[PDB]
């Protein structure tokens, strides 16, 4: 490739326990799943939208976020895999797919260190090889 652009990202989730099981629906946790840049940039320059596919137990399980922050906050009772798909401003630039296990329950290791939220997050890089002129400009602004 003549131009290679690497965009580091962090994705995953945070979760917080209610201290009790809610009577109405059995929900125990609030959680937020997200994708963010690793560096301080405006990702929307080159990201068109990010889609998050939730478990079928959720209403409207295919969620779309079109502007930063690219996050979904929900409540629930169970862990499950979320599929994340990142679309670019050039429709012909192949979207990126990420796989994340939504984490609710804290390790004893972290509990004993006084952590009161669960954070499960992962570093990755999106790699663009010879993107269009328009994409190159927006990736480098």
């Amino acid at each position: 490739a003549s131009v290679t652009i690497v965009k580091p990202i962090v994705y995953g989730n945070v979760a917080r326990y209610f201290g009790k099981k809610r009577e109405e629906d059995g929900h125990t946790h609030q959680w937020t799943v997200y994708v963010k840049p690793y560096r301080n940039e405006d990702m929307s320059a080159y990201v068109k939208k990010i889609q998050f596919k939730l478990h079928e137990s959720y209403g409207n399980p295919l969620r779309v976020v079109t502007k930063p922050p690219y996050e979904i906050t929900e409540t629930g009772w169970g862990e499950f895999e979320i599929i994340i798909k990142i679309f670019f401003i050039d429709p012909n630039e192949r979207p990126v797919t990420l796989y994340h296990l939504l984490k609710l329950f804290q390790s004893d290791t972290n509990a004993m260190l006084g952590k009161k939220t669960v954070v499960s997050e992962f570093y990755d890089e999106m790699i663009f090889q010879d993107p269009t002129a328009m994409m190159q400009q927006l990736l480098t602004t």
Binding site: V6, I86, F88, E93, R94, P95, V96, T97, L98, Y99, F122, Y123, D124, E125, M126, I127, F128, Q129, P131
Partner: peptide
């Protein structure tokens, strides 16, 4: 675009 990491196993 492609990613650095595989789908379900990461460095």
């Amino acid at each position: 675009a492609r990613t650095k990491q595989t789908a379900r196993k990461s460095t």
